Ligand binder design. Structure first.
Ligand SMILES: [Zn+2]
Length: 55
RNA sequence: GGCUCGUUGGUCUAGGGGUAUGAUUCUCGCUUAGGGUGCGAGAGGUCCCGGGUUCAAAUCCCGGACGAGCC
């Protein structure tokens, strides 16, 4: 006789840790009026070695 | 042994140099008995990360060990 590995355990679903979105919201923090590319939660503010307002 | 680690708005595509191209997707109209199929419009990308190079280069060239940090 011969036998080999197979099958998988039971699984579930309902979401992807994302919820509803729109082109006016942010993917990183879920706020509105901006996108992740400009998110205020990122280390690219409020101060750094490039103020971008005096240079 | 303990603690922290929310960037889903494309993906795939060749890369003998231009942010893009090609294949597919989502929404709506028209088409159809019908969410289908085709066509048009709208939703679409500084295409591994950092550094170097002539206007412009994933594999142009170069580095990249078991995920990382703290106690
Ligand atoms: Zn944000």
């Amino acid at each position: 006789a011969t036998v080999v590995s197979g099958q998988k355990q039971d699984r579930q679903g309902g979401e992807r840790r994302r919820s509803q979105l729109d082109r006016d919201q942010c993917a990183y923090c879920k706020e509105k009026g901006h996108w992740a590319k400009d998110c205020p939660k990122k280390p690219r503010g409020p101060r750094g070695p490039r103020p971008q307002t005096s240079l």
